[PDB]
Amino acid sequence: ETLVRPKPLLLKLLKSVGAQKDTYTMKEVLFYLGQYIMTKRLYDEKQQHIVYCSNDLLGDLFGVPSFSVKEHRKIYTMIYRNLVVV
Amino acid sequence: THLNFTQIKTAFALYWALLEAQGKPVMLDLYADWCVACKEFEKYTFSDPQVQKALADTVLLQANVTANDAQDVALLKHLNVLGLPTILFFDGQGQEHPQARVTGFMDAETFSAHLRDRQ
């Protein structure tokens, strides 16, 4: 929704799924993030709402071994912990 | 002329989509060609500009399972869908209200009544 500048790490990931910008809306960041997980297939095929980042940049960036997409707020904070605002 | 729905394939895409909503209520239309009731739904009910406005505050999702491939069946099994048409509703935290499943055809009016049983 509102404009934000991803930190070095969240940018390095974001450029990897075809974002060329340096400044994004929120909905964008969420979108390109979803894509990174689909791309690297970090979700469990059985329980698709479960994401394994331990052993991947996303783990270091969120600082957890795994998480459930079901926990909206937690992920939102883990993201925001890698932005700043215009 | 047609409502604007973002397409989904995997259960992941759905769960990610519910996150991206955060706050907005969500509607999920399962769709297929071989489901006439679905194309009937699309053309007659989602064109109707009364419907369209009752959904303007609501995020709109669509799965196309016409292929009935593995990712299509996993989605359907996980969602516990028995057959099309099926339309699913989510409150703002992304939990489905199963009471408010639609499992049949409805016109513009009946739909807008069922949108008095949403979220």
Residue numbers in the entry:
A (entry chain A): 11 to 96
B (entry chain B): 10 to 128
Any passages from the paper?
The designed binders and drug-receptors form chemically-disruptable heterodimers (CDH) which dissociate in the presence of small molecules. Previously, we reported the design of chemically disruptable heterodimers (CDH) from known protein: peptide-motif complexes, by transferring the peptide motif from the disordered binding partner to globular proteins and using the known PPI inhibitor as a chemical disruptor.
To further expand the panel of CDHs and the chemical space of small-molecule disruptors, we designed a novel CDH-3, based on the starting point of the interaction between p53 and mdm2. Particularly, the dihydroisoquinoline derivative, NVP-CGM097 (Drug-3), is currently undergoing phase 1 clinical trials. We performed a structural search over approximately 11,000 putative protein scaffolds and after the design stage we selected for experimental characterization three designs which we refer to as LD4, LD5 and LD6. From these three designs, LD6 a design based on a thioredoxin protein from mouse, showed the best biochemical behavior being monomeric in solution and a melting temperature of 62 ˚C. LD6 bound to mdm2 with a Kd of 4 nM as determined by SPR, showing a higher binding affinity than those reported for the wild-type p5317-29 peptide (820±60 nM) or the stapled p53 peptide which we used as the input peptide motif (12±3 nM). Next, we tested if Drug-3 promoted the dissociation of the mdm2:LD6 complex by SPR and determined an IC50 of 106 nM. These results were also confirmed using SEC-MALS where the drug dissociated the complex into two monomers. The structure of the complex closely matched our computational model, with backbone RMSDs of 0.37 Å over the overall structure and 0.24 Å over the p53 motif region. The conformation of key residues observed in the native interface were closely mimicked in the crystal structure of LD6 in complex with mdm2.
